[PDB]
Amino acid sequence: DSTECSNLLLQYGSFCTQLNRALTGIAVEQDKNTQEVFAQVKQIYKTPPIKDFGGFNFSQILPDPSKPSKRSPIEDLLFNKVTNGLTVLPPLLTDEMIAQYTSALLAGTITSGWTFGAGP
């Protein structure tokens, strides 16, 4: 909050603007990376209520309805196993929506094969 310090800092020009622009570029780059990785489908697929897949079990990778986070048991284990002018911007995609994207991808690759990645 020192005004004299800012007055002396104005002699150095637009260094602060360059640092802010670089950090803004990194921040939008993270959202672009998440968008490219997870948002590869525009249809949100769901599995059928009856899990008749010819004996194949997907309970460890499908989302658990009992959990409020709507995550898979494996995803729940993964989330449990990971532990002055500074601000942290939240990611554009929340963990619930990323879990929803993975659920849609799992439902597509289980119920529709590779056809959903190339079309309907």
Binding site: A22, E36, Q40
Partner: peptide, 27 residues
């Protein structure tokens, strides 16, 4: 150093997107 790590993470994310397209969405 944040820019260097951002470049590394961008390369890793591009690889991850390639694996998402080629291993999950197809054989």
């Amino acid at each position: 150093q944040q820019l260097i790590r951002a470049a590394e993470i961008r390369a890793s994310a591009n690889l991850a997107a390639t694996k998402m397209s080629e291993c999950v969405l197809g054989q």
